[PDB]
Ligand binder design. Sequence first.
Ligand SMILES: CNc1nc2c(CC[C@H]3O[C@H](OC)[C@H](OC)[C@@H](OC)[C@@H]3OC)c3nc(N)[nH]c(=O)c3cc2[nH]1
Ligand SMILES: CNc1nc2c(CC[C@H]3O[C@H](OC)[C@H](OC)[C@@H](OC)[C@@H]3OC)c3nc(N)[nH]c(=O)c3cc2[nH]1
Ligand SMILES: [Zn+2]
Ligand SMILES: [Zn+2]
Lengths: 352, 352
Amino acid sequence: DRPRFSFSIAAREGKARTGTIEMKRGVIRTPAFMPVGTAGADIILGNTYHLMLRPGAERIAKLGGLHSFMGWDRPILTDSGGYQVQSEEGVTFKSHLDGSRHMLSPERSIEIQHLLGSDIVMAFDECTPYPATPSRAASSMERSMRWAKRSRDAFDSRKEQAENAALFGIQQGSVFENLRQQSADALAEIGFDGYAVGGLAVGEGQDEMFRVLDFSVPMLPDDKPHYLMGVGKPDDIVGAVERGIDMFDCVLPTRSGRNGQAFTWDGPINIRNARFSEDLKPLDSECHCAVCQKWSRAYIHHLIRAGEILGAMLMTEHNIAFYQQLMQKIRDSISEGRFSQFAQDFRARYFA
Amino acid sequence: DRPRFSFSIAAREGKARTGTIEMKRGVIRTPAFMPVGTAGADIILGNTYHLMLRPGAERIAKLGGLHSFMGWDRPILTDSGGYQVQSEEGVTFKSHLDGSRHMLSPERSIEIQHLLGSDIVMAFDECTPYPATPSRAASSMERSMRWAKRSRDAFDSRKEQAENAALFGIQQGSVFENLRQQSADALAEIGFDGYAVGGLAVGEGQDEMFRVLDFSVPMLPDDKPHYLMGVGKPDDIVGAVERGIDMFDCVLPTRSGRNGQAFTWDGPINIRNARFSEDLKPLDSECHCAVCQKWSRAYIHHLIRAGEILGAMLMTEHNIAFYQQLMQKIRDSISEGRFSQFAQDFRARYFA
Ligand SMILES: CNc1nc2c(CC[C@H]3O[C@H](OC)[C@H](OC)[C@@H](OC)[C@@H]3OC)c3nc(N)[nH]c(=O)c3cc2[nH]1
Ligand SMILES: CNc1nc2c(CC[C@H]3O[C@H](OC)[C@H](OC)[C@@H](OC)[C@@H]3OC)c3nc(N)[nH]c(=O)c3cc2[nH]1
Ligand SMILES: [Zn+2]
Ligand SMILES: [Zn+2]
């Protein structure tokens, strides 16, 4: 029987790591990409904010929880709901769907995630806007740390959750090294199963994001998983792994799949462009996915230009699969001691 | 090696028949439902009118024909293009996509279908509008019969087509028995591999459609397949099989699948309705399809209400599968001598 939560590092190269998270419902290979569940992956995401509004967390619990609802028996991660949605108590807001009132606090966020039944629960934080002044970044981060302690206590009070799920704390501090250090220290003093780097992928751009990761990731406990929230494009993932990140989520593969953009080893392509109308190659020449085994760029182009749902489905399947092939190549290259070369080769081709 | 075309009737009950069409690319079990190819089925449809406009028949031929383009190596049926789109020569029209000029005549329709590479080719006809006066129905049907002879001659002139594909003639005559008889006689004198009943499912309603089928289907050669174009809802299919029809096509399973409607043995349901929000049963209680094996009405409701493409995909998979299960039950019941009872039981439950 697997443990509630156990992270093991099997191999390292520079700051990059590869290993496994063992949980009751399954093993998660890291570095991991975690796709949206409503889109192979070891863990999927539930969309807390959306589920709060439709059908509501209590209704999901009545239907048996998200694993039963979605037909997925392996681990599920949920966000805490606030990024998606003010006072020291929490945040209040009205639903556009039916005008109903909703409050969100650390305690209510943890209870919502309990009712959804997720395996990895995020602490309730404030994703500081970018740019932020030092003073506003500090007061925001300080509130998030008080909220992290409240999240910890709420999670620990619910026996089923404490014994079967895991809780991640979220580092804030904007782009400021001293605030990132204070946030890391506060989270480690509380104690979490994993640590997310929050407050990035909010408009700062890759150079600044990587600069912040350079000093921020080493501040977190080395022996616990590191989750970069909201990232990202394939090259963002590669560079973040080089800086010690173990877990990723991003709306891009599905959003791109519905808007005509396919990820390939030679960079993204917009399949609706006329240059693909007679292209008999698969979406990607090396991709092992079922779409690239059977259908051409020309046919996918045709389906999407015709408005056929099949086209969007095939694009999404391809993009999700590409992301998982990327993560597999990352894991194998770290394990084999050739991740530095992989990253260099990946970039040369992706940006050529 | 299978023949170019061979229809065999294995069993009969009343006017209903079950059997097989053997063609070079596969066997088609009848009665058959023929789904749109861009949506198990033995034959799929190509959309001639759409393909003429995007990317064009010549471009499809350059890409290897529809079988290669769509990744489907079994039989394909194409329409002749005119219903979808005037003089004795044919019809002229301008494309809304790019303003280009397109002519359509019996000869050009057959050439388009040749370039697409379809296995069952429809003669180029005029689908008479409904209602029609006797005089207008007669002059329309007479033109269609002249066009049927031109279609036959064009098909026979193209060696690859004549030796490897099949040609169906289309009966017209609106709702008038004498014109339906004249049309049947003219088509049989020309000679076709199969015979379609055209000019129905154009607003006349089920009672009138069945009345016309009652006298029209017996006029066609008994030993050849009978295709009712544009039909239809499940109860239309059952009643048409009772009247001697062997083949069907209809936009409903896919159109309904994209608009929230699911077919079930207890009738159609609109899965977006709030009454399904907590319904843990599968879409249909008896359906063997993968969707009903894994997911609930409540989850499909949620996906479609959320705008997720996955929901539309699952609804479409379910509807296509339901149609093929219906056809399998029809074939088995005729073969077993219990189709009369099946039709009675089907209607009692579908309309309860
Ligand atoms: C884009 N840059 C981006 N996204 C950040 C999310 C949201 C993650 C959430 O982002 C979407 O929701 C809105 C996703 O829905 C499509 C969720 O997956 C279902 C995902 O939950 C893990 C952050 N969440 C928290 N709690 N705190 C953060 O500091 C943070 C930073 C992010 N940067
Ligand atoms: C609804 N009532 C309906 N549809 C009739 C179609 C069109 C069939 C065609 O109907 C859609 O195109 C428009 C389908 O596209 C969704 C085509 O499948 C791809 C399908 O081709 C077999 C008829 N076609 C011809 N040539 N002649 C007819 O008399 C006729 C009668 C129909 N009644
Ligand atoms: Zn692929
Ligand atoms: Zn089903």
